[PDB]
Amino acid sequence: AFFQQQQLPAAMADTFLEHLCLLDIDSEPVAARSTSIIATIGPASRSVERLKEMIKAGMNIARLNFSHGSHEYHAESIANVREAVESFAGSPLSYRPVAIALDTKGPGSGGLSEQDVRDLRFGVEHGVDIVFASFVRKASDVAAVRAALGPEGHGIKIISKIENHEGVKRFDEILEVSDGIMVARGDLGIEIPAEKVFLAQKMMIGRCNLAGKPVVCATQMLESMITKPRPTRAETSDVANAVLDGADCIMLSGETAKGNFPVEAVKMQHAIAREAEAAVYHRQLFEELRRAAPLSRDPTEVTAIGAVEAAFKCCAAAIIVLTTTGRSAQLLSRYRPRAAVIAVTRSAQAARQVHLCRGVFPLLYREPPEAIWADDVDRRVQFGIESGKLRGFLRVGDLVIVVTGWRPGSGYTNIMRVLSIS
Amino acid sequence: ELGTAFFQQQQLPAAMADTFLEHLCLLDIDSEPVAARSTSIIATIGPASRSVERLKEMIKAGMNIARLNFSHGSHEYHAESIANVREAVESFAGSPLSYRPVAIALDTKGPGPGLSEQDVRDLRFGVEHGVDIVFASFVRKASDVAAVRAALGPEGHGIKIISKIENHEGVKRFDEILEVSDGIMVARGDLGIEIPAEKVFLAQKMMIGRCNLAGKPVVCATQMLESMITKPRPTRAETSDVANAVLDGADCIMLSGETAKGNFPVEAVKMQHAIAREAEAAVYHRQLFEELRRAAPLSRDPTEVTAIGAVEAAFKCCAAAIIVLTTTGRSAQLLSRYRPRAAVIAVTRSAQAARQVHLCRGVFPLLYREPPEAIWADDVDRRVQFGIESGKLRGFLRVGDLVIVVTGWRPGSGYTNIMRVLSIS
Amino acid sequence: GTAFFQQQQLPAAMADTFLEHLCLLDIDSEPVAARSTSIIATIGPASRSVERLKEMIKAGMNIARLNFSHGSHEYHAESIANVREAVESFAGSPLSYRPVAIALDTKGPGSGPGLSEQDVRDLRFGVEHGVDIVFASFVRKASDVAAVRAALGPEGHGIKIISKIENHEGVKRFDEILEVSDGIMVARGDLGIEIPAEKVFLAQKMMIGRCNLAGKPVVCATQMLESMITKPRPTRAETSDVANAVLDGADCIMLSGETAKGNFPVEAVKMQHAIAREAEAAVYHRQLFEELRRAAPLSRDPTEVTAIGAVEAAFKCCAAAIIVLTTTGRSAQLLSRYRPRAAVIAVTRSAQAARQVHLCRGVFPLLYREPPEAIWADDVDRRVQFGIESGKLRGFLRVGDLVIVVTGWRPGSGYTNIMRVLSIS
Amino acid sequence: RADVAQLTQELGTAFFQQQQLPAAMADTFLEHLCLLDIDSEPVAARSTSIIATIGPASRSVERLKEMIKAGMNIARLNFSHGSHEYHAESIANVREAVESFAGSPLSYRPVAIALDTKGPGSGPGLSEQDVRDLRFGVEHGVDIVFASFVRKASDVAAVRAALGPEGHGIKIISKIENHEGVKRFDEILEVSDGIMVARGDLGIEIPAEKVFLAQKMMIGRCNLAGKPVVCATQMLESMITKPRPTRAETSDVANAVLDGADCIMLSGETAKGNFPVEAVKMQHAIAREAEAAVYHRQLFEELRRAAPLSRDPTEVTAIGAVEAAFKCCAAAIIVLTTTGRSAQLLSRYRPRAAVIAVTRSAQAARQVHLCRGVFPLLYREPPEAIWADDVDRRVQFGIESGKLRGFLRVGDLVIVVTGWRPGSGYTNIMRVLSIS
């Protein structure tokens, strides 16, 4: 029964053609949904009660669109998101962190506009986790956003939105200085011929997967759900294909900001992403990612490849990793393991930000500290296992891969262990 | 010899990539498509696309197959639609550069446990009016296809039966249905109601893959550009859906309400044409050909053996086209199953085969009406030169180009066994 | 039949990985194909008798090597006369006649920087006596090949020059030497003294790989069955060395003392024949063909395009042979470079080309002696029928087999452009 | 180039020109052959073990010391010749020569002793002389038995029974010498510790032109099973009377290594020939060149794909460690092992990194020579009170010995493989350590 679920016959296929032939509508997804859902906050999704339903439906990142509304309006949205998120903190083994992303208005006819400088300062003051920088055309646009965030906003992730021909052409220099990319198909589809957007999307997703940096697919993914309870056949296909392309995140704009079915739009993206993740041809994907990732003398990078290889060998239910900044989890995620990457962290910001990386499930550690560092590490590992058991990721008898470091502090991951559950 | 500009167009850098990941990384929005659009467009005929003048614009925009939806309208209404399609098609018989055969497909109302009384009557109407294809609704098992085949009476055995897979049973019994059908339609509308909507993409990709493996045509249908029923431009999900259906391996893409009742029927056809052209150049032929080659069983059929040799030869020299002489369309279909980048120009004396080969990706039919030569080898040479001259006229070919020519050793269907490399003069 | 798929290591040939290919190799799977790697036998006191040469031709000797390091011009002229007498003793049966090439192996430069005066005289002797091939000793750079070509003069333009790589400089300047040579000999004797003995296998494997990539013949030479100079059976290392040279991709394997001075020249030829046959069936064609196709550059030459189409067609149908008409041997060489499992039966009127194509693996030359038919198409057909009848007599073909036939559109060399699938009747 | 650019800038272009690294990074096997370079020097320690047959030409203690220095890893006693008294003296001389280097534990090289049986002769199974010789082997503490003419699984069970309860730790390597052994190979391999391709008798029992097929098939199946395979007979035959081998002989040795053989053997070349030390030196030189010419890119991919999914933590850790070693061009993989099993599971994936196996078992240290690329280090120190400290001391012993023997330099990355509790069977940890 195990080998009939999660498209495992299609996953073992010798060719991509045979993989397609073996895809089965009766093969149920079992793994937790890996691709994060970004929901745009607006009148249809601003109330605390509505936000609680969206968190339960699968929203991982709340997007604030600074193209509309005042700073007072957005501060209220942030407070409501935090209130809804913290209403589940009473049960630490099931608490789900939710990131807050600020999407800038953009340069308009102008580099960095004066309104963007003020909005970015607002983001730092209100503790946003991510900035979706509009109309990034070159590396200096990213540097300007980074400078406007100042010394207090050093830890904020900058996701550059590629929205025009210049951004596509200067993609490599933009990705090099950004934390990730958003394929902003709305403006891109007006700036370049609409029939060419899929080429830009597939290229950018492929280059971000190669670089090991997050990539978001955005705009009109479930557009008809703004007024209708069910999406069109092209919309479900678009969501599934963005996941199959390799997108780390998928986004909802008007569907959640102003539509009549915000919760249903989140549920639909969750349902499709789960089905599409199981249909990924891991046999070829892992081989190509493994071959393309350069040789490295960084122990975190070396441990990450060893751990993902070990996870595939034993059909590991999860890879439990201890991380301070999220980096060790990101390096595991870049190899696209089928095993869930359970990231145990003390940082609340890193727990929110790792939603940008596909297949990373953040667990915010709030248990009493241990006096012995080795005992403290072992307790965080057992915490990952208990949360994993409660959430359905793990069962007794499963094998897990555990990734830790040799000393406290970020940058010292160098150990991989094979552990049998219970 | 060809120029550096030649190797920058039609995603040739992405086509030469060593891995699928590198192929994606090399896709370029500035790399323009050059080849003719190979995925056929099926447009549903209705009030918005029934007039002769509107049909002429749709033919110019790229419509290859006219679909008659027998779920609505009387036999009198459909006979008028057929006459208007034929009038619009024949209005271009004067210009070889603009003339294009257009197939007529009858889409049945559907079942009841099996073939309904109305379907028997509608299928008889199709035979009497000379339709080329039947899109059989709600096919669930092999016996449903046999019933449709039996209903195509004594005169309609040459009509192609494309089984529409619309429910869980059709998906589960797919292999037995494909074995007896000429092709398949992934009817996503009903399929998305019969099975969970989030599972339709799995059924679509599986069926397209199995049809590509079998070498049989597969159509992707329903809501591909739905928003264009009221809006002049489609959504980002809709263009993505069309491009991904072509990348999946679909031979045909379809328009329903977009062309039958919408406000922008011609623009919907133009949009599918534009997207299919871009998506066909983005196909990763290096891995696709290797896998089709490996999956296709060994064969002692000379048409099958010649077809793979010809497609291999076309890739080796970047041939502008493969010109094939075919009476039934079968030799062109066997070339099409290996997905060559070269256009397959099919020269036939059969007007029905010329219309039906639109079901096969990359087949460009040319109907030949010259009187037969007394010396058979001369008749063959005249048809090969007709394909070359039409190719030059239409932009497929130029003097100095290499073309692959596929012919047989004797007259009659079933004897294809020759592949030649010709330099265009 | 099921028995067909158990022979010639067909289970190992269909394997998905090289490891699984090795695991499926079967000592009970009998070779069926004709032996495709040519055997070069060096002539000497043990192999000069006309009666002894007839037995060596029957055992499988394809090329007779004259070592100009020993003997005078008078000695070599007698060797040539004896070889020709033994070869021509079988000309009374044209369907079974086996051409045998004559190769002149030069003494070398010695302490000199380039072409020695003795080599100039020996090369002129070769042209005057009609030798087919020159094995040029100690080639260190492209100008050494040009000097050999100049010494052959205008009358020796058709002689093939195979450069012997015997030292570090020849290995380092390999690419420039191969570019101007017709082929290469891995002369392991001197190479093993000039460079550390433990590194010779790396030079052998590299040169064979680069010659296979270039589509040019490569010979493996020296001490392959050394112990057979005095013993009736070779050592385990010797049979392994012959099998591995064939698996590496060598077009030819050579015997020196084993045939020139030993006590078992006929048995040494028979042993190389037996081993080469076993090793050719053990070649992993699935990966080899894929890599040769991918590495071979795109081409606009119709002979090159037809060759890859014909090899692909031959693999698709398990063709027993590819029958090719050739004037210079070039069309057969271009088929051979893709390493088909099907025998390449080359029909030619040129006695020299028939002898020289033994340099290319899997090419079986048939010398056609009949004067041309008045109708060129009938002369082409008669030559193809001669290939089929010789093939049937020699066991290459049976009724019911499929064969690929490679011809051109006009008389004269350079116009091959047609591939046809033919059933043997 | 993008996949190796940063590491090329860090380690230098000279590093990437050595040990056939350009040929190792090739995208196809054809390109791998085209990139093989006679100027690309081998750097890694020789990983294929050399088995030398002991006889009159290689019996003296002083001669044996030269053969150990030349590279002999396993001493073979051919029980087809000589009495029990003769073989006991050979064993004592081998042990005396081996122990003459024990004064320096950081450089001491263990040498295994293998007993090669006379065989069944005309009989259907285990002969009475073989039963007596096998009992002699157990009494004299031999490490390995090369069982002659194994034709079926019951032949190896008979050898195992003749070894008795005291010989349970002895490795049984079945010699495949006839058609029946080749045809029943899978059942023989399943119950054996490894295989020997005995080409001498095999070449008489089956047509000589078919021996290479049997050799390549058996080596491939042993590599797939992760069990040692020995290539034997006439590898450097001419060196019995001549100082240099023929071109076919060097080719045969190189091709046995490229085929995937864990061990290569010398028979008459060492036992009775005129150049025993030179024959060992020649096999050493060729094996080093051939190991660097192995196409690891395809080999690792195929071993990974063919090896079934596993829930055994030693197996899971082994593939993770070999993958990690390739990622960083690790100089070595240091593994703690009691029976040799954790080192054998690393060896089956054919890493380019040397597998330095630290063990307290003198027998396991000798027996791991059967596995390609395993360098045994015998740890003689008594256990620390705290088990975690005892583990760390053993790892440090491997690093210090690795530095001493030239395997490791400061700045190198090393992969360390250990377990969560004492005793055999609990390996489950992989660590990436930077050498300081």
Ligand SMILES: O=P(O)(O)OC[C@H]1O[C@](O)(COP(=O)(O)O)[C@@H](O)[C@@H]1O
């Ligand atoms: O992913 P990051 O940011 O490098 O953090 C990984 C770090 O986490 C640890 O596993 C635990 O460290 P702390 O005890 O400081 O939380 C370290 O050993 C390791 O260096």
Ligand SMILES: O=P(O)(O)OC[C@H]1O[C@](O)(COP(=O)(O)O)[C@@H](O)[C@@H]1O
């Ligand atoms: O594709 P089909 O229907 O098999 O037709 C292919 C046939 O066309 C030809 O090339 C030309 O035949 P006709 O002259 O009868 O049209 C035949 O030699 C070949 O058998």
Ligand SMILES: O=P(O)(O)OC[C@H]1O[C@](O)(COP(=O)(O)O)[C@@H](O)[C@@H]1O
């Ligand atoms: O292999 P080559 O030397 O190019 O010769 C091939 C030539 O042989 C032919 O098949 C037959 O030519 P001939 O009639 O002159 O022998 C030509 O059509 C073709 O050009």
Ligand SMILES: O=P(O)(O)OC[C@H]1O[C@](O)(COP(=O)(O)O)[C@@H](O)[C@@H]1O
């Ligand atoms: O390779 P083997 O025979 O399984 O031995 C590996 C064992 O060695 C160790 O690393 C150390 O164990 P010891 O302390 O008993 O020597 C164990 O943790 C592990 O189980």
Ligand SMILES: O=S(=O)(c1ccc(O)c(O)c1)c1ccc(O)c(O)c1
């Ligand atoms: O799943 S894959 O192996 C694959 C292969 C061939 C195809 O045509 C295809 O659509 C998908 C894959 C996907 C994304 C990658 O970036 C990659 O490296 C591999």
Ligand SMILES: O=S(=O)(c1ccc(O)c(O)c1)c1ccc(O)c(O)c1
């Ligand atoms: O037969 S092969 O596919 C092969 C693959 C892997 C091996 O390790 C091997 O020894 C042989 C091959 C491929 C290309 C060649 O140019 C060749 O000579 C052989």
Ligand SMILES: O=C([O-])C(=O)[O-]
């Ligand atoms: O701003 C965006 O997200 C867009 O334009 O697609």
Ligand SMILES: O=C([O-])C(=O)[O-]
């Ligand atoms: O009938 C159709 O086309 C459907 O259901 O999608």
Ligand SMILES: O=C([O-])C(=O)[O-]
């Ligand atoms: O000349 C030769 O043949 C050699 O050196 O091997």
Ligand SMILES: O=C([O-])C(=O)[O-]
């Ligand atoms: O017994 C042996 O070692 C042989 O036959 O090779």
Ligand SMILES: [K+]
């Ligand atoms: K915005």
Ligand SMILES: [K+]
């Ligand atoms: K209908």
Ligand SMILES: [K+]
């Ligand atoms: K010579």
Ligand SMILES: [K+]
């Ligand atoms: K013995």
Ligand SMILES: [Mg+2]
């Ligand atoms: Mg925008």
Ligand SMILES: [Mg+2]
């Ligand atoms: Mg329907």
